[PDB]
Ligand binder design. Structure first.
Ligand SMILES: Cn1c(=O)ccn([C@@H]2O[C@H](COS(=O)(=O)NC(=O)[C@@H](N)CO)[C@@H](O)[C@H]2O)c1=O
Ligand SMILES: Cn1c(=O)ccn([C@@H]2O[C@H](COS(=O)(=O)NC(=O)[C@@H](N)CO)[C@@H](O)[C@H]2O)c1=O
Ligand code: NA
Ligand code: NA
Lengths: 420, 381
């Protein structure tokens, strides 16, 4: 949610900033609703003035021994219209709120203005994509060899876009997730958390997936119970820890890390696109003055995972036309994928500003004013575990089809140094 | 599903054995349907044959497993037999606190934030308690893979109906599952246990005799919409480290003893006193022939509480899955036997760790085997 006062009073300036995202604000409808509101409010004011006078004129008519029936009938009619005037103003405000819940965030001034994906800038890249002396295999060819990565058995259980891992590939996947959590808790100042993987609608509305992106979620419809949704990311559960709270300035920043499955009902082959995937999520609840510096740190934390695994990657600053709904500024990390001869997305790191904090009423008590003020929220993958496994399998492949274990993962691989 | 030959050749004995579970086998309806199929065959139309076949198959999928002759005969939980114990429950020199009071002290176990997010029967864990939960699950999976011969697996947590019918949750227990209704697609169900995904790896296959035993281990969330039940004891979501075995039918009752010892080892290494209960015929799970429950000591309750269920399913799930192996003696593809057991339910291990390891000041001492996973933390709070 944007600032309601800003959208209602400056719809033209808000529309112009939003147009950079390709989003066309319904300025004609905001102004029409605002014209209707002003018209009803002026009618209720004139009626309040008329009814109050008539209601007190009954007292005076009584003192004169006069008939009060014409006056009571006037007051009663006026009262009934004021009650409708309230219903009209409530239904106008109701329509305006429903509309404001579907508006994407305002891009920060520093975001490059672009109409599409081609206006995204490379910020920097790290490491050098390996030149192989043999024909590179993809992660599907590599992992299927001994049945350690099995899409057929997963299709037999659950249908398309699911995976089954066994033996050393399953251990390598767990090693990756354990390495990420241990790194963020030991070196990057994040507090570990275990969260529900099923949330009710209010949590998803707090982070921006609801009301607009319901069709992308798996829903559990329940009889006489509030429906449950499978989390698309631990961002939903972690960010909402602070909903409806006034935090002390001393408690900021709150930094959370969670390793959870992620469920989405939205080449893309093998493990690139899945209905379920593990992701180690980083979430920060910060002082608004520090959120853009916090984003730089958050991005460096996700990068550190790739540097430690020695995986060549690239950092992209997303343009205005290529951002997520609730983001003011995003950096995408893209890992080198040898079988594709390109870098592919492995993490998105965003500053949401006060957009999610507004929806969930997550606040802090400002020290200067003493007044409760909205916090800023940030989130970032550090990393999507299945995609890192794809990167590990492909970048560490040997000529015989075996896989070298990355150095930082050997303590988790129980003596295994080469897979197959 | 039960052997169709046994149901036909020995109806009275199969019915008398099932009656020890409190299940009344409808021999009359089964044999009346068999007579109708035989009469319709001698005349052959397709409508009446498919209706009789659909009726018979639906009945057949509703019959629980035959209890093994070594299973104590009883009507309820009070007839379950304690077969052994391990360890001495601790005598505390202060008033014992439950895991809820222990965990809630610094916000590290938070039922209120979880309720705000998801409603009742959910949990949120933070900092050293979340780290201890993760340490427990890592310990269990590292133990089973390194010492007990189990191959690790990452599985889907959403399955379609045939996998649940393969292990016995469907058709009879649909109400206990969280279903995802999918428009113009097969509905998905959240897994109640990794037993569903692990056991079904071998469905529709003829394995090699040399491939047996197949021993799988997985750490997964478990989702169910179903004595003291406070906090993490009962949840809609909980983590469980599951052990599954696909074995030669001749070895399955020795394999159950080995599976039960694997689960027990986690409790021994954590130094958590417990007891082993041989479930009676009237307290057994639908798909089981024989079950041992592990019940860990819970100081706040002054009693042992269930933390694991180890079962031999015989050929029951194999029949539903058509999971076979090529018999080296005969040459014929024969049904395999299947087994599963918790090693362990992670949330309930955490309850047991918090309570048994608590100290006078409300702090919790970290179990010895968990210290390598706790980043220097030896005392929680
Ligand atoms: C397997 N798989 C998918 O099918 C889809 C996405 N991803 C990775 O997940 C990362 C984070 O997803 S996101 O871009 O929608 N952003 C978030 O979820 C925020 N909570 C920040 O993480 C993407 O960068 C993909 O690499 C998959 O792995
Ligand atoms: C939190 N919680 C529950 O809410 C319910 C059960 N349990 C434990 O899970 C163990 C295994 O569940 S079971 O008995 O249904 N058996 C199986 O699922 C098999 N696949 C073997 O694991 C129970 O023993 C409870 O201790 C919870 O922890
Ligand atoms: Na992205
Ligand atoms: Na049980």
């Amino acid at each position: 949610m944007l600032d309601p006062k800003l959208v209602r009073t400056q719809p033209q300036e808000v529309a112009a900033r939003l147009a950079t995202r390709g989003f066309q604000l319904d300025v004609a409808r905001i102004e029409a609703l605002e014209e209707q509101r002003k018209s009803v409010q002026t009618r209720t004011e004139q009626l309040q003035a008329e009814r109050n006078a008539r209601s007190k004129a009954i007292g005076q008519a009584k003192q004169r021994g006069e008939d009060i029936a014409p006056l009571l009938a006037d007051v009663d009619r006026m009262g009934s219209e004021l009650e409708e005037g309230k219903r009209q103003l409530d239904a106008i405000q109701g329509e305006l709120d429903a509309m404001l819940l579907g508006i994407p965030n305002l891009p920060h001034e520093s975001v490059p203005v672009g109409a599409d994906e081609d206006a995204n800038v490379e910020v920097r890249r790290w490491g050098t994509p390996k030149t192989f002396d043999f024909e590179v295999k993809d992660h599907v060819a590599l992992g299927e060899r001994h049945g350690w990565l099995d899409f057929e058995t997963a299709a037999k259980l659950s249908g398309a876009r699911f995976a089954l891992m066994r033996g050393p590939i399953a251990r390598l996947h767990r090693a990756l997730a354990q390495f990420m959590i241990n790194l963020h808790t030991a070196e990057h100042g994040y507090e570990e958390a275990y969260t529900p993987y099923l949330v009710q609608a209010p949590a998803l509305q707090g982070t921006g997936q609801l009301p607009k992106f319901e069709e992308d979620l798996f829903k559990i419809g329940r009889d006489g119970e509030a429906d449950l949704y499978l989390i698309p990311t631990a961002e939903v559960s972690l960010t909402n820890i602070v909903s409806g709270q006034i935090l002390d300035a001393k408690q900021l920043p709150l930094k959370f890390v969670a390793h959870t499955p992620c469920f989405r009902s939205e080449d893309t082959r093998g493990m690139i696109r899945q209905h379920q995937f593990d992701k180690v999520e980083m979430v920060q609840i910060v002082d608004p003055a520090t959120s853009y510096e916090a984003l730089e740190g958050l991005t460096a934390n996700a990068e550190r995972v790739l540097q430690l695994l020695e995986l060549p990657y690239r950092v992209l600053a997303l343009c205005t036309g290529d951002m997520g709904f609730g983001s003011t500024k995003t950096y995408d990390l893209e890992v080198w994928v040898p079988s594709q001869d390109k870098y592919r997305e492995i993490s998105s790191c965003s500053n949401c500003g006060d957009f999610q904090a507004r929806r969930m009423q997550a606040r802090y008590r400002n020290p200067e004013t003493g007044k409760p003020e909205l916090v800023h929220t940030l989130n970032g993958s550090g990393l999507a575990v299945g995609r890192t496994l794809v990167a590990v399998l492909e970048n560490y492949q040997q000529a015989d089809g075996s896989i070298r274990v990355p150095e930082v993962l050997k303590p988790y691989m129980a003596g295994i140094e080469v897979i197959g």
